[PDB]
Enzyme design. Structure first.
Site, PDB file in Angstrom:
ATOM      1  N   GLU A 121      45.903  45.346  44.107  1.00 28.46           N
ATOM      2  CA  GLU A 121      44.658  44.823  43.549  1.00 28.46           C
ATOM      3  C   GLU A 121      43.573  44.875  44.654  1.00 28.46           C
ATOM      4  OE1 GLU A 121      41.685  43.731  43.002  1.00 28.46           O
ATOM      5  OE2 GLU A 121      41.902  41.531  42.851  1.00 28.46           O
ATOM      6  N   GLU A 124      35.924  48.621  47.859  1.00 31.10           N
ATOM      7  CA  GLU A 124      36.807  48.087  48.912  1.00 31.10           C
ATOM      8  C   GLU A 124      37.833  49.105  49.310  1.00 31.10           C
ATOM      9  OE1 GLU A 124      36.547  43.257  47.908  1.00 31.10           O
ATOM     10  OE2 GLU A 124      38.527  44.325  47.783  1.00 31.10           O
TER      11      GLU A 124
END
Ligand code: SAH
Ligand code: ZN
Length: 624
Positions: free
Chosen positions: A120, A129
């Site tokens: 995740e 990210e």
């Protein structure tokens, strides 16, 4: 030390751990994949690689679902230790090993490579990210052939909209309201990211001009399909004529490749059966570099761009690459501050008070990135704009030239106003302010101005007031509440260390764009402190009881200022008879979330000290 403890504070990513639907959906993708590998691997043994393990939550879910070996990777060393503690003090201790490396540095995970990768590692913009490289290189190096990943697939959707509201977060402000007012030239806007809870846009504040368009498809299970830089021209059919004021963006990921189980970031009005509130993920607004109009039932094209971390959208035949701010505005001001100036330039009641206060006078303006003086120039004989920031001086210089406001002067220091003005006018607005009360810098420029000219120097606003109110938010509170036990796993170790590193490195009062969070208010606004506009600035301290707390989960706080005969509020604008507050979209408000010891009380005691010495207001909450 301090950099390390601050980042441990961030590590919870607001409501991430408490996002019930996120947690269900990864659990579901793991069940599906662990069950395929249970059947496929001749021995029934299933090795799971959890990348970005945080507290270790996902690794716990893999082992409890029957993975025979779980290896968990966390780059951030203190969260790595947290995970090691949490998983080694659980029933799955023997099955789970935590390695504190970034997955990209690991070269082998030993002895065997993964049957399954769960990560995740996504933010609102999906790729921001590192997801792309994280998956691509984990597949090259850390995974067996036919490795399965959770999630397996993802899309990014844009929807064109016509919206006066969203335009206000992006337009170079127009002193006189017409286009073609281009005071600063033409500008792209930044490629800074604008994250917004689009679910809280009222239906009248926008109009969709097409069905959602699939800007990008990603496929996180095949190494070679992951390409860092891409551009695609994409097509859709207008179902309304209008102008593309903004491009709404969000994504969805398919947890197990089945076309059935999804995390879907679509807004509440456009995600009719897969919508759950959350904050660590939201939706995003992008703007085209130039105007683009659209007619039904015409075909139109948006050029869809990305690099490793970033998305941007351009028009056909215009050039593909990323466009930066060239006017200096989008790069200096926060989105809500652009909205603030555009709102002030269109506010007829404000503009009237400014004309009536300036008429035929020498006005001096104090603030930092405050545009007020440009409005005062309509009716004033002379305007001295005092702004300590060089780049805002350059902006104002372009506006005074462009609109030929020859009665305005721009100077750097309050102590350089050697002619005594007839009135000082301010919002007050200082860009530096992280808090609505940090505009209290005003009190000090006033002290200096009264010392230099006299104590009877007229100044507006003439009173400021700090206010608070009890509110019961629907969801927002969960950015701050303790994580406790989640999916049956005790995560309280995380709360102890998270508590510690929030206590040390964080403010007591949070800052949030409250218009983006639905709640209902539970009492009257209450005055905390009141600031006269005086010779000398004085410390003040008070203690006030905030009742109605037992049905509330938060206390918003903001400033209100009496500008001549009107009231400016940096927070609460009104409350519906149903109790729904409306919040000024041009500022963030302060909100305190009752600490866990306090969750229950029917009233809290608020303490605040405005400290003349720091210019700041300290709060503590407790007792009763
Ligand atoms: N490639 C990578 N390898 C290891 N850690 C990573 C990484 N990319 C991001 N991270 C870390 O992984 C985390 C993403 S937050 C998600 C945490 C956890 N899987 C959960 O769902 O609750 C952050 O802790 C960040 O430090
Ligand atoms: Zn710009």
């Amino acid at each position: 030390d301090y950099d390390m403890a601050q980042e441990l504070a961030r590590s919870r990513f607001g409501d991430m751990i408490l996002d019930f639907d996120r947690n269900d959906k990864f659990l579901a993708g793991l069940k599906t994949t662990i069950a395929e590998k249970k059947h496929e691997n001749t021995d029934g043994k299933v090795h799971v690689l959890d990348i970005g393990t945080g507290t270790g939550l996902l690794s716990l879910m893999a082992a409890r679902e029957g993975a025979d070996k779980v290896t968990a990777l966390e780059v951030f060393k203190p969260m790595g230790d947290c995970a090691r503690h949490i998983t080694s003090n659980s029933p799955w201790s023997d099955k789970i090993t935590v390695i504190s490396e970034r997955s990209t540095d690991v070269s082998q995970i030993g002895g065997s490579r993964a049957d399954i990768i769960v990560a995740e590692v996504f933010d609102t913009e999906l790729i921001g990210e590192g997801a792309l490289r994280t998956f691509k290189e984990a597949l090259e190096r850390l995974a067996k052939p036919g490795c399965r990943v959770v999630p397996s697939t993802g899309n990014v959707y844009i929807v064109p909209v016509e919206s006066h509201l969203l335009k206000m977060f992006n337009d170079i402000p127009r002193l006189n309201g017409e286009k073609d007012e281009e005071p600063l030239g033409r500008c792209s806007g930044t490629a800074a990211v604008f994250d917004v809870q689009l679910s809280e846009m009222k239906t009248h504040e926008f109009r969709e001009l097409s069905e959602p368009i699939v800007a990008f498809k990603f496929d996180f299970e095949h190494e070679e399909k992951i390409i860092f830089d891409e551009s695609f021209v994409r097509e859709a059919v207008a179902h309304s004529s209008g102008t593309i004021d903004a491009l709404l963006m969000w994504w969805d990921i398919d947890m197990d490749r089945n076309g059935t189980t999804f995390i879907d970031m679509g807004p509440k009005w456009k995600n009719k059966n897969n919508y759950a509130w959350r904050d660590h993920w939201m939706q995003a607004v992008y703007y085209l570099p130039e105007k683009k109009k659209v007619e039904m039932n015409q075909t139109f094209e948006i050029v869809c761009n990305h690099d490793e971390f970033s998305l941007w959208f351009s028009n056909v035949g215009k050039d593909k690459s990323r466009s930066y701010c060239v006017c200096g505005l989008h790069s200096m001001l926060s989105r809500q501050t652009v909205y603030h100036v555009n709102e002030m330039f269109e506010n007829q009641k404000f503009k009237d008070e400014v004309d009536k206060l300036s008429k035929g006078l020498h006005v001096a303006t104090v603030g930092e990135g405050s545009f007020l003086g440009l409005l005062a120039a309509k009716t004033a004989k002379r305007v001295t704009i005092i702004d300590g920031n060089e780049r805002f001086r350059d902006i104002f210089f372009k506006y005074i030239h462009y609109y030929k406001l020859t009665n305005v002067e721009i100077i750097e220091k309050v102590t350089s106003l050697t002619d005594s003005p007839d009135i000082v006018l301010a919002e007050p607005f200082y860009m530096s302010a992280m808090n609505p009360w940090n505009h209290l810098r005003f009190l000090y420029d006033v002290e200096v101005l009264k010392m230099m000219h006299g104590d009877e120097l007229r100044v507006e606003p003439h009173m400021g007031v700090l206010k608070a109110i009890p509110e019961k938010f629907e969801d927002l509170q969960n950015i701050a509440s303790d994580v406790g036990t989640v999916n049956g796993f005790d995560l309280s170790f995380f709360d102890e260390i998270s508590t510690k590193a929030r206590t040390a490195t964080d403010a007591i009062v949070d800052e949030q764009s409250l218009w983006e969070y639905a709640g209902i208010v539970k009492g009257d606004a209450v005055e905390i402190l009141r600031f006269p506009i005086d010779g000398r600035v004085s410390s003040q301290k008070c203690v006030v009881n905030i009742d109605n707390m037992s049905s509330s989960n938060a206390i918003p706080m903001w400033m209100e200022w009496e500008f001549g005969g009107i009231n400016l509020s940096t927070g609460l604008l009104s409350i519906s008879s149903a109790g729904v507050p409306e919040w000024n979209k041009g500022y963030k408000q302060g909100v305190y979330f009752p600490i866990t010891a306090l969750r229950n009380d029917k009233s809290l005691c608020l303490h605040a000290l405005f400290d003349k010495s720091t210019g700041d207001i300290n709060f503590q909450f407790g007792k009763s």
